[PDB]
Amino acid sequence: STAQARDEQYRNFLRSVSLLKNLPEDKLTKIIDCLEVEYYDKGDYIIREGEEGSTFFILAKGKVKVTQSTEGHDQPQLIKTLQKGEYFGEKALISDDVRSANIIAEENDVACLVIDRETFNQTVGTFEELQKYLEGYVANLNRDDEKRHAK
Ligand SMILES: Nc1nc(=O)c2nc(Sc3ccc(Cl)cc3)n([C@@H]3O[C@@H]4COP(=O)(O)O[C@H]4[C@H]3O)c2[nH]1
Ligand SMILES: [Ca+2]
């Protein structure tokens, strides 16, 4: 349809994302303008632990699992699942680190909205309330990683 109507469809979804509900319009618009879409089928690794990463992901369709290598275990342990409306991949950006867990599609036809580091920094990373929320969440993820003896 129009660019505007496509944008409205993305705006409506992004405003249903709890993380983004309070973001200023101009930064939401920048996410709409800069996002890309990636599709995955069941078992695909969206993120692999021990890889460089500088992109942030919003799950628009489907479910993924979060797994992580830990001490005393040979296979990665299942931390949680994420569903439509949730997000992942901020930690590498905020911690300036390699990817710290695997993100694996649990269903066929998973769809992610992806933005790069500069876009992230200029939107999420620039709106104080959200920046601080994610920085604090990442600090807790560090303590969870320590608790479970992440390798
Ligand atoms: N180290 C680590 N420990 C966890 O206990 C954990 N739980 C999750 S789901 C989650 C998603 C977003 C927020 Cl703010 C909080 C939790 N994640 C996510 O996995 C991704 C791997 O790639 P990355 O770039 O390291 O970002 C990471 C995180 O997004 C975790 N990472
Ligand atoms: Ca456009």
Phi, psi of 50 (to 5 degrees): 95, 25
Distance CA 92, CA 56 (A): 9
Dihedral in degrees, nearest 10, Cα atoms 29, 31, 34, 37: -120
CATH number at residue 90: 2.60.120.10
Distance CA 5, CA 12 (A): 10
Task: Give 132 Cα–ligand 2 centroid separation in angstroms.
Answer: 29
Per the annotation, binding residues for 3',5'-cyclic GMP are 80, 89-92, 99-100, 145, 148
**Ligand nearest the Cα atom of residue 138:** 1
Q: Enumerate helices (H) and strands (E) in the chain, giving the number of each.
A: 5, 8
Instruction: Give every strand in the sheet of 110-116, ordered side by side.
Output: 36-40, 110-116, 55-61, 87-88
In contact, 69 and 76? CB cutoff 8 Å: yes
Count of domains for the chain: 1
**What experimental approach yielded this model?**
X-ray
Task: Give 1 Cα–ligand 1 centroid separation in angstroms.
Answer: 36
Interacting residues of 67 by C-beta distance below 8 A, sequence separation 6+: 49, 76, 77, 78, 79, 101, 102, 104
Unique residue bearing structure tokens 């390798």: 151
Q: After which residues is the chain broken (C to N over 2.5 A)?
A: none
Containing domain of residue 147, as a range?
1-151
Model resolution, angstroms: 1.5
76 in ligand 1 pocket by Cβ < 6 Å?
no
Interacting residues of 110 by C-beta distance below 8 A, sequence separation 6+: 39, 40, 41, 44, 46, 59, 61, 62, 63, 64
79 in ligand 1 pocket by Cβ < 6 Å?
yes
